[PDB]
Amino acid sequence: GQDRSPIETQNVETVLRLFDEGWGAQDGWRDVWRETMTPGFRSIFHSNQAVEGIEQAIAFNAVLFEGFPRLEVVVENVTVEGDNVVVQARLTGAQDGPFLGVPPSGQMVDVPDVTLFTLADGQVIEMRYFTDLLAVMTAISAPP
Amino acid sequence: GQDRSPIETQNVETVLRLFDEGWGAQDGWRDVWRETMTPGFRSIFHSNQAVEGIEQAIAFNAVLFEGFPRLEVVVENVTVEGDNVVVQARLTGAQDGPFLGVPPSGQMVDVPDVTLFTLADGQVIEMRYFTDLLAVMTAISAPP
Ligand SMILES: [Cl-]
Ligand SMILES: [Cl-]
Structure with missing residues (x-):
């Protein structure tokens, strides 16, 4: 296969930090x-309207991690073409805090x-996200 | 940007047929x-267990399109790296048939x-899928 270009590999390296030192479970x-996102970074959670601005997007991420x-x-696939980086992962953990209106x-x-990133000049400008949120909400809302 | 390799571009061309002549709304x-998938093709819908086999996977797709x-x-982003093709799209239409237990x-x-394809030797071997299925189920289950 064709090797990643320098920009592609740097884009990947930059994005992958968000799954380690930049992961919301990590201090x-x-x-x-x-340091990674632009000030006008936009976060898109499933079909929700974009959360605009880095501090706003950070605040939104923080809410999710309270749950x-x-x-x-665990990252299990990285696909990059130019300024688009796609990361597939698996998530595991307990809903020990409030999450999207459901008590812990x-x-x-x-x-x-799957997280879909767009970069410009080495910085992340947009992040789109999907999981199986219906399955998550069903699992955590389930009676005792 | 670095141009797609021959295999990458052929992978894209092959996958994109599934969004036109191979789209489940199209006769x-x-x-x-x-002609596109291998006999042992596996279909993965959100976090559901894989549907194994091309006829089984076709049957599952057909059920979805009844809804x-x-x-x-409308395709709005294609990202390819080697044998991985990622297609982001938007879906629009009415729930005029039964869908995942909800009456029309x-x-x-x-x-x-977002649809995440894996190919081998020019054929599609796996397809992983996500939409905002919680939003869909909420919208179609909503009281009159
Ligand atoms: Cl912090
Ligand atoms: Cl047909």
């Missing part, structure tokens, strides 16, 4: 987001996901 | 699937999606 992630404060991510249940989740 | 799509028989797709409601949906 210090916000500063990694601030799953120990959430683990302690349920375990184990789901695939 | 004759099954035969397009049969949205006129569903329209006639609701309109308008959602982004």
Whole structure:
């Protein structure tokens, strides 16, 4: 296969930091987001309207991680073409905090996901996200 | 940017047929699937267990399209690296048939999606899918 261009490989390296030092379960992630994303970064969660601005997008991510404060991510595919990087991962952890209106249940989740990044001049400008959110909401809303 | 390799561009061309002549709203799509996918093709819908085998996967797709028989797709991003092709699209149409246990409601949906293909030797061997299925189920289950 054709090797990644220099820009492609740097784009990947930059994005992959968001799954380690910049992962919301890791202390210090916000500063990694601030060094990686542009100020006008836009975050898109499933079909929700974009959250516009880096601090706004950080705040939104923080809310998600209150629901799953120990959430683990395992990257299992990276695909890059130019300034588009696609990361597929699996998420595992317990819903030990409030999440999208559901009180903490302690349920375990184990789901695939996909994050679709756009970069410009080495910085992340947009992130689109999907998981199996219906399965997550069903699992955590399930009666005792 | 670095141009697509010959294999990458052929992979894209092959996959994109699934969004036109091979789209489940289009008469004759099954035969397009049969010429594009391998017999052991695996289909993965959100976090559901894989549907294994081309006829099984075709049957599953057919069920989905009974719910949205006129569903329209507009491709809006294609990203390829080697034998991985990622297609983001938007879907629009009415739930005029039964869908995942919900009787036909006639609701309109308008959602982004992402399909993640793996190919081998020019044929599609696996397809992973996500949309905002929670939003779809919420929209179509909504009281009158
Ligand atoms: Cl932090
Ligand atoms: Cl057909």
